[PDB]
Design a protein around this nucleic acid. Structure first.
Lengths: 175, 242, 95, 125
RNA sequence: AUUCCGGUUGAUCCUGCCGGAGGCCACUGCUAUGGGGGUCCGACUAAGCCAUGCGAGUCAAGGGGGCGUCCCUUCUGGGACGCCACCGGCGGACGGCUCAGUAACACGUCGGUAACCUACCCUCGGGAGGGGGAUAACCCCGGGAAACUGGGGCUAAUCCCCCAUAGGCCUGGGGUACUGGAAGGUCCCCAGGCCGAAAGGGAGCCGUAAGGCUCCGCCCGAGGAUGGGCCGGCGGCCGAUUAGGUAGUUGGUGGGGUAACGGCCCACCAAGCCGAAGAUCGGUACGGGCCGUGAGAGCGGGAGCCCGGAGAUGGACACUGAGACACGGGUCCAGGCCCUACGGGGCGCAGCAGGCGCGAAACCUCCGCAAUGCGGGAAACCGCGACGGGGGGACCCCCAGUGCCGUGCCUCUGGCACGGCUUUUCCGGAGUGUAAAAAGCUCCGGGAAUAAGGGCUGGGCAAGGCCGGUGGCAGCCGCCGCGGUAAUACCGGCGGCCCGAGUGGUGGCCACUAUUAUUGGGCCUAAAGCGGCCGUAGCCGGGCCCGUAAGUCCCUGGCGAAAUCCCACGGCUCAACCGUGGG
């Protein structure tokens, strides 16, 4: 007889000091310019939750099972981690890099709005990036496929000016 | 520790048939005793404020109710704790609006708009029949209302029948018997808001309730309780029941 | 500062009209209650003495602010229905 | 008070410890040993829920009914026999099962004088 | 992640335990820039004791008065709206707090009350006829240190009492009209009796009057509804170094009492009732929804939120009321205090703050009834330490910062120099926000300006075979182990490795552990087969044929509250959080 206690959304590795896991995680953090290990662990937990849902629904029969399978496929396709013609089997092929590529930081860097990943993080935090008509200052936000093409500089941000020195420096990185 | 009747009601303990946000606040209106039960009724304050949006705060909702701008059946109700139940007619003459209170497919109470010609009719299921002083027959309906008839008409009324009463004059228009082929509307259980025609009635030993089989418009046969079957017509529903 | 009226509802039990609107104003501070009321009155020909702004709310990282207003048929009805604090906030009462 | 709550012993024979104080709703009242006298004496008791009870402590008259439905009001002389208790007959205490002697003969009580306030009996043939 | 690693030998393979490695909760060392959301913060020891302030009031449209203003007739006396107290009505039995006691029909679930009560509320059918009587307030006189309180006079009511009629309850004799699965029930006709109603009050609009309309009202009957009372089947804890227990006990016949059935109690008649399938007794403990952990089976907890149960310093009693034997009403006893003029009189924060004590252990003597609700009122409205808002706190989750870019140097996982760029944060202002503030949100001015610590460095386990000091001392060490003058293991400096606004230490639970083994452990030599047989309950039992559906399986009705759990969508920037649907 206890009330609800809010729990962590991420998981800690079973052993804190394993060489292979440490090197792999260090490579990931260096590549994606994450701030702390629990961010990567949160993304890994999201991937593991998707995989667990797929595994549970694969061996389930019923109308509710069918509804849940279709809903999971639709949610994954909307998030953009699977092609529009994917099936339930394709869920188990997802990797941590696939989820990491959907971060607002990664997409902002990829689109050329920032010269580097750290610059993308600073721009997002300071509020120079807008999604749809809304400004989001969370570098870990996952961008939906439908709203992926609406990402640009905020109309109020100085970077909206093409003649800004920093914008010109960023643009020169493209060539 | 308990020494008498309760006077409060927490939102988390509110009946499941209400369209109420159970975590927005802590307290909910405790329904005053009235026509229907707790599980088949909702206080008039919620209908005035949340369901229709005519008021934002309980203060102005109470002001509207005290100004006599809301009518249940044919009588003006000024009590914000007055229960409004199944087959009730809520009338707002200032806006010319008439609603019938009915359960939906998941057992929640909703308001279904109706016409002025239908706003004067309220079906009443005969819950019980007894005798009073002077050899007169008293009929007790599903909403606790009572009617008195002479002993001559004792064979024209029976339990589970339906009486179409004109409100607020309280005049009997006609009687719909409970028999095979009679249109019914399920008001409680797992098959709420389902409608069809009677097929068979099964009775059981001891105090176990009778069961009735109903064929819907699609030809499917489903069982429910006889007390849950509400007659609303002979071959077609005499009231709008969508 | 551009005002777009998203919804107008006619309440007859309480003799008023409820107006839900939005204010688009990138690169500008949140508009004052006096200015919002003046523009709304000028646009909807409402009576300045019987109109009250319930709230003007700004959101995180947004150039649009939501606004709610009520225009009553009579000043006496507005005094009877509306709370004293909202009238003081809108300046309809010297208190 | 005269507590009329649960027993203190289990049917097996074990002891029961009360987990709560005595409640007002579980209390009884003293017996009304309705005695034969010269004048009727009755009192009114306010009971649970604001109800009323008529308690007859002294009885001088009785309504004796025959087999044809005819009833007569007569006087009680003595209690011949009371099967409820071995001392009631000698103490002239009228209960539901008592047998009394009246001007018309032997009658068997059928009412509860402690709860009714009147004494009704049937003639013995 | 359905996992392993270190330790018994000169070396090996086993059994076996101990320790590492993960998660959650409570204290605690060092350290700390923010913002949101939530059901967090004197539960563990003391259900120990409390200064102070507050935590139940409302009705003037039930009644008579006192003070004020106005309109005046004008000595007369009339009419008003403001305030005040009193009588009178309702509420104060709900909410708030705590887990002491309780192993029990206390709780969960499914069924009964055809054996029962119910003020406020809803519907139908009826009634409101005639009389009497005090007293509060106010005036005179006081008593007493107070707490409290006496006498006389004069008054009204929706105050109290009486009569009548309706009506209730019992019993006897008849008819079967009704609901029910079934009538000790309801209905109708006689008879004997007991009990036994009301406020035609109040307000407003008319009407010359009479009288009429509307609202709020009063009493009885039949039903509901609301909150309960009682009863039954089933389920949920350890101890046999506790084996017999019970004597109103088990049942009955007749009664009493209760609102109700009942050994609840009484009189009489019998010996029954419980128990090795764990009685009785003792220990511990509020029960459940749920929470922690684990791949699951399972194991452990059940303070915070919801429902149900108990308690108000320890007990026992009663009055009033529909509801109490009543936390902020009453009486007595036992313990602990307070005022006193010594005669006497009062109190108990397991309510919100606050204090003492206890301990390792837990906050402001704050603002408002604006939102949700409850009581009162015809309504406006008033009150509410319930609730809402803020204050302190490394309570739990979610989102961020402590800069970014270009060029060039270096002892290149990073620092330095130069030239630029924004402002999450910080600082100062304007709106919006809020009951009023605050925070938050939008915008302007200045400026990288204000922001990193904790453990570890022999293996297990990622990280140095460098330097200086001590030298079987000082010390370190969860375990193995190090230290004896060449210490990668102690202290310190310089390097490095892990996490990061957190990181260590201790206690507790789960996994680890197939070391509790139904899934799924062992017993020749390592822990363990009774020294051996017969046999009672229990458990397990040969083949075929027919019958029943108890177990079993499939389908279909009534259930197992909500919150909590999973999924999809939608709303606070996304999220935490909340809403709508499915499970």
């Amino acid at each position: 007889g206890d009330p609800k206690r809010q729990r962590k959304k991420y998981e800690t590795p079973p052993h804190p000091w394993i060489k292979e896991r440490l090197d792999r995680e260090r490579v990931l953090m260096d590549k994606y310019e994450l701030k702390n290990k629990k961010e990567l662990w949160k993304h890994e937990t999201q991937l593991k939750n998707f995989r667990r849902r797929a595994r549970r629904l694969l061996a389930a029969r019923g109308k509710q099972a069918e509804i849940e399978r279709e809903q999971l496929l639709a949610r994954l396709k909307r998030l953009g981690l699977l092609p529009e013609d994917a099936v339930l089997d394709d869920v188990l092929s997802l990797t941590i890099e696939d989820i990491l590529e959907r971060r607002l930081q990664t997409i902002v860097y990829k689109k050329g709005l920032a010269r580097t990943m750290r610059q993308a993080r600073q721009l997002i935090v300071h509020g120079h990036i807008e999604v749809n008509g809304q400004i989001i200052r969370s570098p870990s936000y996952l961008v939906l496929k439908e709203e992926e093409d609406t990402i640009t500089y905020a109309r109020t941000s100085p970077f909206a000016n093409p003649q800004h020195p920093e914008r010109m420096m960023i643009e020169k990185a493209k060539q | 520790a308990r020494k008498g009747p309760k006077r409060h009601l927490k939102r988390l303990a509110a009946p499941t048939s209400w369209y109420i946000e159970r975590k927005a606040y802590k307290w909910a209106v405790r329904p005053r005793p009235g026509p229907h039960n707790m599980r088949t009724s909702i206080p008039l304050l919620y209908i005035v404020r949340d369901y229709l949006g005519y008021a934002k705060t309980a203060r102005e909702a109470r002001k509207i109710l005290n100004e006599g701008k809301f009518l249940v059946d044919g009588r003006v109700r000024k009590d914000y704790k007055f229960p409004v139940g199944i087959m009730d007619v809520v009338s707002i003459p200032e806006t010319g609006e008439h609603y019938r209170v009915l359960p939906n497919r998941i057992g929640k109470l909703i308001l279904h708009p109706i016409s002025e010609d239908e706003a004067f009719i309220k079906p009443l299921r005969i819950r019980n029949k007894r005798m009073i002083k002077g050899a007169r027959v008293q009929l007790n309906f599903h909403d606790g209302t009572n009617h008195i008839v002479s002993i001559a008409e004792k064979d024209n009324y029976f339990t589970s029948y339906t009486v179409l009463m004109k409100v607020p004059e309280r005049e009997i228009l006609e009687v719909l018997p409970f028999e095979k082929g009679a249109y019914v509307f399920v008001t409680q259980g797992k098959n709420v808001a389902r409608k069809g025609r009677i097929v068979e009635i099964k009775r059981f030993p001891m105090g176990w309730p009778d069961v009735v089989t109903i064929e819907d418009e699609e030809g499917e046969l489903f069982d429910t309780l006889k007390e849950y079957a509400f007659v609303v017509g002979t071959d077609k529903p005499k009231i709008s029941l969508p | 500062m551009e005002i777009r009226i998203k919804e107008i509802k006619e309440n007859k039990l309480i003799g008023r009209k409820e107006i839900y609107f939005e204010i688009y104003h990138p690169g500008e501070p949140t508009p004052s209650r006096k200015d919002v009321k003046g523009k709304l009155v000028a646009m909807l020909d409402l009576n300045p003495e019987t109109t009250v702004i319930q709230y003007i709310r700004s959101y995180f990282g947004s150039y649009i602010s939501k606004g709610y207003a009520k225009a009553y048929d009579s000043k006496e009805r507005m005094l009877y229905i509306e709370p004293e604090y909202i009238l003081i906030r809108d300046g309809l009462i010297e208190k | 008070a005269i507590w009329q709550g649960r027993s203190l012993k289990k049917p097996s024979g074990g002891r029961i410890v009360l987990a709560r104080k005595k409640r007002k709703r579980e209390l009884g009242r003293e017996p009304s040993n309705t005695r034969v006298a010269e004048q009727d004496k009755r009192k009114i008791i306010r009971t649970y829920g604001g109800n009323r009870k008529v308690r007859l402590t002294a009885a001088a008259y009785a309504n004796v009914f025959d087999k044809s439905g005819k009833g007569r009001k007569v006087r009680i002389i003595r209690v011949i026999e009371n099967p409820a208790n071995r001392q009631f007959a000698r103490r002239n205490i009228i209960t539901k099962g008592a047998i009394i002697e009246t001007e018309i003969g032997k009658a068997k009580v059928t009412s509860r004088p402690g709860q009714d306030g009147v004494v009704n009996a049937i003639l013995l043939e």
